[PDB]
Amino acid sequence: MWQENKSWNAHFTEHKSQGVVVLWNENKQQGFTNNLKRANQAFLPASTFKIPNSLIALDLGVVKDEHQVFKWDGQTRDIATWNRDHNLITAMKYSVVPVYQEFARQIGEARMSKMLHAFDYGNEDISGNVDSFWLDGGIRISATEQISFLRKLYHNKLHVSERSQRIVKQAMLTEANGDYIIRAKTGYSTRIEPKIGWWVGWVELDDNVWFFAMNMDMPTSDGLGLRQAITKEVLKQEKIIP
Amino acid sequence: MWQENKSWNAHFTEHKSQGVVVLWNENKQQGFTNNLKRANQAFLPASTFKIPNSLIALDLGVVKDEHQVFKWDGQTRDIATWNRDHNLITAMKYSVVPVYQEFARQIGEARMSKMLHAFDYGNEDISGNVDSFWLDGGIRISATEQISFLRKLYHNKLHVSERSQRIVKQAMLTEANGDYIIRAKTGYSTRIEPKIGWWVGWVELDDNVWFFAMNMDMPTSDGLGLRQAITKEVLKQEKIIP
Numbered sequence: 112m113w114q115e116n117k118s119w120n121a122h123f124t125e126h127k128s129q130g131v132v133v134l135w136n137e138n139k140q141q142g143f144t145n146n147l148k149r150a151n152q153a154f155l156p157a158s159t160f161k162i163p164n165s166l167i168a169l170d171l172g173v174v175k176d177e178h179q180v181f182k183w184d185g186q187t188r189d190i191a192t193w194n195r196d197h198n199l200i201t202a203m204k205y206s207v208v209p210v211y212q213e214f215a216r217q218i219g220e221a222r223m224s225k226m227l228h229a230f231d232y233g234n235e236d237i238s239g240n241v242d243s244f245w246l247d248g249g250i251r252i253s254a255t256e257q258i259s260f261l262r263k264l265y266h267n268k269l270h271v272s273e274r275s276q277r278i279v280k281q282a283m284l285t286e287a288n289g290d291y292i293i294r295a296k297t298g299y300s301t302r303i304e305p306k307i308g309w310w311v312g313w314v315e316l317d318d319n320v321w322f323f324a325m326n327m328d329m330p331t332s333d334g335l336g337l338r339q340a341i342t343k344e345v346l347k348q349e350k351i352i353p
Numbered sequence: 354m355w356q357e358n359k360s361w362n363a364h365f366t367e368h369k370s371q372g373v374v375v376l377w378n379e380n381k382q383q384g385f386t387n388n389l390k391r392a393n394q395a396f397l398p399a400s401t402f403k404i405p406n407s408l409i410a411l412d413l414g415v416v417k418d419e420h421q422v423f424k425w426d427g428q429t430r431d432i433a434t435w436n437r438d439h440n441l442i443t444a445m446k447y448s449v450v451p452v453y454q455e456f457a458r459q460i461g462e463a464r465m466s467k468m469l470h471a472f473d474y475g476n477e478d479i480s481g482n483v484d485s486f487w488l489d490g491g492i493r494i495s496a497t498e499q500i501s502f503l504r505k506l507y508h509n510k511l512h513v514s515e516r517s518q519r520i521v522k523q524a525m526l527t528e529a530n531g532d533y534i535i536r537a538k539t540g541y542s543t544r545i546e547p548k549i550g551w552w553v554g555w556v557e558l559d560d561n562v563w564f565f566a567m568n569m570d571m572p573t574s575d576g577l578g579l580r581q582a583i584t585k586e587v588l589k590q591e592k593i594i595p
């Protein structure tokens with residue numbers, strides 16, 4: 112059910128990088144990875160936690176819908192796209208942390224713990240601040256655990272309303288053309304070592320769905336584009352995308 | 354509220370074509386078109402009727418969800434992509450008429466007419482064959498009436514369940530990148546003159562949505578790509594997409 116394909120390491124080696132890419136063939140129920148050990152190594156989810164955070168916020172009514180505007184708090188921050196009004200779609204697209212920190216505070220630690228346990232999400236640990244535990248707290252999730260969570264979300268099997276799951280899957284939309292649809296979420300963990308970058312999601316084809324979860328060492332923010340580039344090179348080699 | 358911009362006609366003249374493009378700015382509540390008269394002239398919806406047909410099939414339970422497989426009936430047809438199994442997403446993507454003719458037969462004339470009346474869709478006339486009235490029957494819809502219908506769908510305002518509307522909006526996904534999301538449906542009306550090609554939908558931006566409905570004279574299937582091409586040129590001229 113799991114298979115190691117160490118040939119994908121050349122895509123990491125070419126860009127002087129190191130990480131793991133995990134693929135899941137939904138039709139055949141088979142998994143593939145270049146490093147089974149790192150595939151099961153649990154890291155801070157960083158901004159990939161915006162997927163479960165969105166689900167909980169929508170199911171609890173903290174977020175009314177994907178169109179509700181969340182005004183900029185006026186604090187000018189270092190990322191320019193953060194200093195503006197956002198809805199759920201654009202907050203996920205630009206990884207607007209302060210918007211989701213506001214969501215987490217309204218959710219509260221008690222409901223956040225209960226929901227993450229219902230989601231079977233990682234180690235289900237929210238130790239630290241309720242509005243930063245996915246950035247510098249105790250929550251840890253592996254690439255294979257991201258796949259298991261994403262597979263439940265795809266099939267609407269999470270312990271939330273179907274509506275919340277459909278809205279979040281819409282907000283995860285990243286790329287779409289005549290060949291494939293990518294619903295995914297980026298992540299960048301910097302507060303706690305090791306500094307890593309995430310990209311988790313799935314590729315929808317006409318007759319199949321390929322779930323993917325990747326993470327890689329990210330000492331500097333200059334290599335952040337390699338998350339999508341290395342993943343797409345693996346997808347191209349596997350004939351998943353042209 | 355409505356403004357005519359005849360400069361768009363140059364994009365039709367460049368390809369030796371004739372048609373109308375209707376744009377609606379949702380934030381500003383203004384509309385723009387190159388031909389006010391043709392914008393309100395009613396044509397056969399052709400495969401753009403797959404939007405309301407999908408909504409009706411979903412709300413009535415004829416289609417359970419976007420994953421239900423509709424098996425190929427075995428008859429080899431002219432369009433190769435039709436000679437295979439389909440779900441709601443691929444049937445919309447490839448405009449698989451035989452799949453939607455089966456939907457219309459299951460829906461029936463009484464339910465179809467009741468729903469189109471509730472939708473305020475076009476002239477609400479289902480006269481003709483139960484499984485082809487949108488291709489050669491009495492139903493007619495204008496480009497502005499398409500936008501009016503699409504605006505209700507975007508806001509989950511149609512009388513069907515919100516779930517049915519969210520599923521159809523997902524199935525309408527055509528293109529997505531870091532700049533915009535296009536949810537649209539193509540159409541090609543050939544059985545009754547004038548032969549016309551349709552493209553209706555909307556473009557999702559970060560803080561606005563531009564609804565569009567275009568139709569153009571289409572004597573042959575060779576120029577079907579001009580529907581998107583001319584629409585994109587108008588969108589680029591109005592600085593909606595880069």
Ligand SMILES: Nc1cc(S(=O)(=O)O)cc2cc(S(=O)(=O)O)cc(O)c12
Pocket residue numbers: 158189190205206208297298299309332335
């Ligand atoms: N929370 C964050 C997510 C992402 S994402 O590309 O994975 O979505 C990138 C980030 C980049 C920076 S910075 O170092 O460039 O200022 C800081 C962040 O907090 C980020």
Ligand SMILES: Nc1cc(S(=O)(=O)O)cc2cc(S(=O)(=O)O)cc(O)c12
Pocket residue numbers: 400431432447448450539540541551574577
């Ligand atoms: N139902 C149809 C929809 C479309 S669409 O691109 O507007 O969706 C194109 C079509 C082209 C042909 S043909 O002339 O190439 O045989 C035949 C069709 O039935 C079509």
Ligand SMILES: [Cl-]
Pocket residue numbers: 280281284522523526
């Ligand atoms: Cl979508």
Ligand SMILES: [Cl-]
Pocket residue numbers: 368369370570571572576
């Ligand atoms: Cl032409």
